[PDB]
Design a protein around this nucleic acid. Structure first.
Lengths: 325, 189, 146, 75
RNA sequence: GGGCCCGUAGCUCAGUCUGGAGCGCCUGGCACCAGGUGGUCGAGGGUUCAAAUCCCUUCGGGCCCGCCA
């Protein structure tokens, strides 16, 4: 069993994992970051990775010997720049400390791969929604391609700033999910589906204008929640119609909100298709996904040269030589 | 949005109904189907004022959220643009005036431009009125993304011919193109 | 259903008192109605679409005028001497209207001509590519929009 | 504005490891806000950064501190 | 036909008798809050020591009574 250590530094949740080629995760740990919701000329908040990667790696050292592993994979991209650099430098350090092969791994594609392994799906159309990266991606012409993506703000960032103005402490995900359980009036907001894409600035601006009038908290919470989730479900439906696939996946931290899951279940029930979401251990930011995709890349012979493992903060999903069908 | 083609004794009718979406709240579902069929009818009719060919509207009904229009026995743009590159120039043509009068088809693609005898713009399911340059730029971005994801093999020539037609019919194309370049790069730092 | 009767009468005489006779009919300018398609579409919508005018047979004028307003619809599609078009259902009412107005019975006026084309275009503010008969059909179709 | 950073290591081998690990990352920046030289001298590493901007210089030196600390704390 | 509020930065609304905050943004960096270069205000007419600003007509568009043949 080719043991691999994977590292996740794409966003505010550091992840360290080790996995095997048989299809199981030997170890996986995550640790989030909670910022004070803002910052002016701010120091980088990705240093949390630089602090907890040593701790998580040492804990992995206690659970498994530091020489036991065989390969290493780091989240090359896409993601926050400095955090990607931190996980890259840590992976290189471990790789040529142990003198082991290293590989850069696409964060999104790792999300799809773990969503596939944790579930029965074979080649699903993914809806990867998170704090700063929401997009639907498909396997077309031996490539993961972005079909519909936001244009202004991701769903996670949208809910984050909505909770910021509601002043629900971060994370505001479950807070909004529960506060919207009793929303009564469907506040008028701008519904927008620009082709495959989505705009989210207008939704937030309308919510802010409504809260200037000081309307009911739960009502606007429910209105924004339903509006955003309906827009995402609509672009997912039209992307699925474009693909004419049979399986759809939902990945990313924001998928913790159960109403998105129920909405997608209703959509697929009406469209006679099946649908999955990875568990929280694989529905956030963790090193297990990067480790798994590094093993997948190196198993079929796609070796990775150490020098050209340079990261790309704007790492598009269609610049990965996918050769594992 | 199901379409039924019927042959009335003097009318060639196509009834397009906007089926409700189970995943959405029935309140918001009804509201959005009503507003969307209203906007589609009004804009697809107002585009005739431009000279831009479009299907004729025989009647509408918001309460039943349906539009029954003049059916066209043609083929989709994508199924024919592969074997004919001139309809990209024609798309540039009939989008130039459409953008000139500041009405935006926020669903511009190469899949809803029927070619039976001419180029019919058969869908403003998301048409809007706005003078905002950002809306026009994002509409152009959506069209470019659609032509990419559909015909990557010929994207360059297809977009060049479309832009040639557009600049032939529209005169302020330079500023919207530079906004296109400035906005399509808005990914990360 | 009773097939409604539409007649294009040349040589028209204006007589307001007919409208006070309690007769279910409507009279319009025959040179503005495009063809039988125009009146058929207006009648069909006034039958189906939610009533908005104060009278059904005046709703016929409201529909075929393509305008909810009546105050200017009477101005723009009101009957004019020389040629008119009458829609009704009663043979006795037809005879009474024909006697009170006079003229010749010839439906062939439903055919459109270049002068009719220009008159329709200047009346309905139509400026765009499209055959005028179905363009006017559409212009009638979209009364029920804000 | 010049900035010289010296980093010491327990052994020459560890110094070579951290140098090779941060070598690619030094070249992995698509655009550098400041000129940077990153070199190895036996059991030491020297980071020489020339910048005309103080804020970006501080950001770069803090990022180098982060990556070097992570590298040395891996073992 | 007759009322209503209206029509003010290029997109956001007061400034009415009592005659500029907004926003790609010049002003900070990895959304967040401070600076503003950028309006002289539906059209026309009369009043004016100073008129969107006192009044009238028209132009759309939204809204009430609509008043029909």
């Amino acid at each position: 069993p080719m043991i691999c250590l994977g590292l996740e530094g794409t966003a505010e949740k550091t992840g360290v994992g080790i996995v095997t080629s048989d299809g199981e995760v030997l170890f996986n740990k995550t640790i989030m970051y909670k910022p004070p919701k803002q910052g002016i000329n701010p120091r980088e908040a990705a240093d949390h990775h630089a602090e907890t990667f040593p701790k998580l790696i040492k804990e992995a050292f206690e659970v498994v010997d530091k020489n036991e592993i065989d390969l290493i994979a780091f989240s090359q991209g896409p993601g926050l720049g400095p955090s990607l650099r931190v996980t890259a430098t840590v992976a290189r350090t471990l790789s040529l400390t142990l003198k082991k092969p290293i590989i850069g791994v696409n964060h999104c594609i790792a999300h799809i791969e773990i969503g596939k392994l944790t579930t029965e799906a074979e080649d699903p159309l993914t809806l990867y929604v998170s704090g700063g990266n929401t997009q639907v991606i498909a396997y077309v012409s031996k490539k993961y391609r972005v079909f519909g993506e936001t244009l202004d703000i991701a769903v996670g960032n949208c809910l984050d700033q909505f909770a910021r103005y509601v002043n629900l402490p971060h994370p505001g995900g479950p807070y909004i999910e529960e506060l919207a359980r009793k929303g009564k009036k469907l506040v008028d907001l701008p519904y927008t589906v620009k082709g495959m894409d989505i705009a989210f600035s207008g939704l937030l601006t309308a919510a802010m204008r409504a809260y200037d009038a000081g309307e009911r908290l739960e009502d606007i919470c429910y209105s924004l929640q339903e509006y955003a989730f309906s827009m995402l479900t609509e672009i997912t439906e039209r992307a699925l119609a474009h693909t004419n696939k049979g399986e759809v996946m939902l990945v990313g931290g924001v998928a913790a909100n159960n109403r998105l899951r129920e909405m997608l279940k209703a959509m697929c029930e009406g469209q006679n298709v099946d649908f999955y979401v990875p568990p929280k251990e694989f529905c956030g930011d963790n090193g297990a996904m990067i480790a798994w995709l590094g093993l997948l890349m190196h198993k079929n012979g796609r070796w990775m040269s150490l020098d050209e493992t340079k990261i790309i903060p704007n790492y598009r999903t269609d610049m990965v030589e996918v050769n594992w069908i | 949005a199901d379409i039924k083609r019927d042959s009335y004794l003097d009318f060639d009718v196509i009834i397009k109904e906007r089926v409700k979406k189970g995943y959405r709240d029935e309140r918001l579902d009804e509201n959005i189907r009503k507003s969307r069929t209203a906007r589609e009818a009004r804009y697809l009719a107002l585009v005739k004022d431009f000279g831009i060919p479009a299907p004729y509207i025989f009647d509408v009904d918001l309460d039943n959220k349906r539009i029954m229009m003049s059916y066209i026995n043609g083929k989709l743009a994508k199924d024919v643009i592969e074997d004919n590159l001139d309809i990209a120039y024609k798309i540039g043509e009939i989008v130039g005036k459409l953008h000139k009068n500041d009405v935006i088809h926020n669903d511009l693609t190469t899949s809803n431009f029927i070619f039976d005898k001419d180029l019919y713009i058969i869908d403003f399911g998301l048409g809007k009125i706005s003078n905002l340059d950002r809306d026009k730029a994002v509409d152009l971005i959506v069209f470019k993304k659609a032509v990419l994801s559909t015909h990557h093999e010929k994207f360059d020539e297809i977009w060049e011919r479309f832009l040639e037609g557009y600049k032939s019919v529209y005169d302020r194309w330079e500023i919207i193109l530079e906004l296109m370049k400035d906005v399509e790069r808005r990914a990360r730092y | 259903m009773d097939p409604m009767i539409i007649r294009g009468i040349r040589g028209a005489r204006i007589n307001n008192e007919i409208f006070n006779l309690g007769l279910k009919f409507q009279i319009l300018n025959a040179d503005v109605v495009a063809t039988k398609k125009h009146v058929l579409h207006a009648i069909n919508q006034a039958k189906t679409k939610k009533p908005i005018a104060k009278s059904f047979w005046m709703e016929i004028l409201v529909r075929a005028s393509g305008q909810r307003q009546i105050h200017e619809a009477i101005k723009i599609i009101g009957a004019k001497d020389g040629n008119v078009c009458l829609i009704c259902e009663d043979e006795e009412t037809f005879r009474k209207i024909y006697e009170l107005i006079g003229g010749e019975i010839d439906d062939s006026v439903l055919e459109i001509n270049e002068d009719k084309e220009r008159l329709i275009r200047e009346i309905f503010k139509i400026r765009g590519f499209g055959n005028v008969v179905e363009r006017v059909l559409e212009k009638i179709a979209l009364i029920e929009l804000k | 504005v010049q900035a010289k950073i010296e980093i010491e290591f327990p052994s020459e081998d560890v110094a070579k490891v951290v140098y090779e690990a941060v070598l690619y990352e030094h070249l992995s920046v698509p655009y550098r806000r400041s000129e940077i030289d990153f070199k190895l001298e036996g059991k030491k590493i020297i980071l020489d950064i020339k910048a005309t901007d103080s804020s970006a210089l501080r950001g770069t030196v803090n990022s180098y501190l982060r990556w070097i600390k992570a590298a040395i704390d891996v073992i």
